[PDB]
Paper text:
MLKL is a key player in the necroptosis pathway, encompassing a C-terminal regulatory and an N-terminal executioner domain. To this end, displacement of the auto-inhibitory brace helix (α-helix 6) from the four-helix bundle is required, which depends on a specific composition of phospholipids in the membrane. Currently, two classes of compounds are reported to inhibit MLKL by covalently binding to Cys86 in the short α-helix 4 located on top of the four-helix bundle, which comprises α-helices 1, 2, 3, and 5.
Here, we present the high-resolution structures of the human MLKL executioner domain in complex with a covalent inhibitor of the xanthine class solved by X-ray crystallography and in solution by NMR spectroscopy. The binding pose of Cpd 3 was very similar in the NMR and the X-ray structures of the MLKL:Cpd 3 complex. The most profound structural change induced by covalent modification of Cys86 was the alteration of the conformation of Phe148. This resulted in a stacking interaction with the aromatic ring of the xanthine core, therefore creating an additional contact between α-helix 6 and the four-helix bundle. Here, we report that the xanthine class of inhibitors acts by stabilizing the packing of α-helix 6 against the four-helix bundle through the formation of a stabilizing π–π-stacking interaction between Phe148 located in α-helix 6 and the xanthine core. Mutation of Phe148 to alanine leads to loss of the stabilization of the auto-inhibited state of MLKL by xanthine class compounds, confirming the key role of the observed π–π-stacking interaction for the activity of the xanthine class.
Author numbering: 0 to 49, 52 to 123, 129 to 150
Write the structure that this text describes.
């Protein structure tokens, strides 16, 4: 439980750091890192106590860990310029992290509801809109 929480928080931090160093598609990569850092903030607060998670909370945390591992795999893949160029030429909307953003948003909704109801923690609605704007800003930076 404590080890699981530390692993997820470390994943989020490595994803943010890797997104910050990305040389291409900076708006989309920076948005992914910023969103991940914001999602792990209440998990950092829960970790700062040292309570026991229910099995429903453990299930939701493990699903969130799986979405973060997928995001880390995508950032690692896109650290190679050729993989970015290949993916974007094949993509329809030019949104680099479309699939993993959907998974992060869906798994986060279940997890935050359990943190609020079970651990008394005090949403990805604008995300698809922000994704299209960041993708356009990135496409424009590339087209100069
Ligand atoms: C390859 N093809 C790209 C890009 C890119 O960043 N963007 C935003 C695109 O729209 N396309 C089609 N890359 C990545 O490499 C950028 C050029 O580096 C020299």
């Amino acid at each position: 439980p404590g080890e699981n929480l530390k692993h997820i928080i470390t994943l989020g931090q490595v994803i943010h750091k890797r997104c910050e160093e990305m040389k291409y598609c900076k708006k989309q990569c920076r948005r992914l890192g910023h969103r991940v850092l914001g999602l792990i903030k209440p998990l950092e607060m829960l970790q700062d106590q040292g309570s026991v998670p229910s099995e429903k909370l453990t299930t939701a945390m493990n699903r969130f860990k799986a979405a973060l591992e997928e995001a880390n795999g995508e950032i690692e893949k896109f650290s190679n310029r050729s993989n970015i160029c290949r993916f974007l030429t094949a993509s329809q909307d030019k949104i680099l992290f479309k699939d993993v953003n959907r998974k992060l948003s869906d798994v986060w909704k279940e997890l935050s509801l359990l943190l609020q109801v079970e651990q008394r923690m005090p949403q990805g609605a604008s995300w698809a809109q922000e994704d299209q704007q960041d993708a356009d800003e990135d496409r424009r930076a590339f087209q100069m």
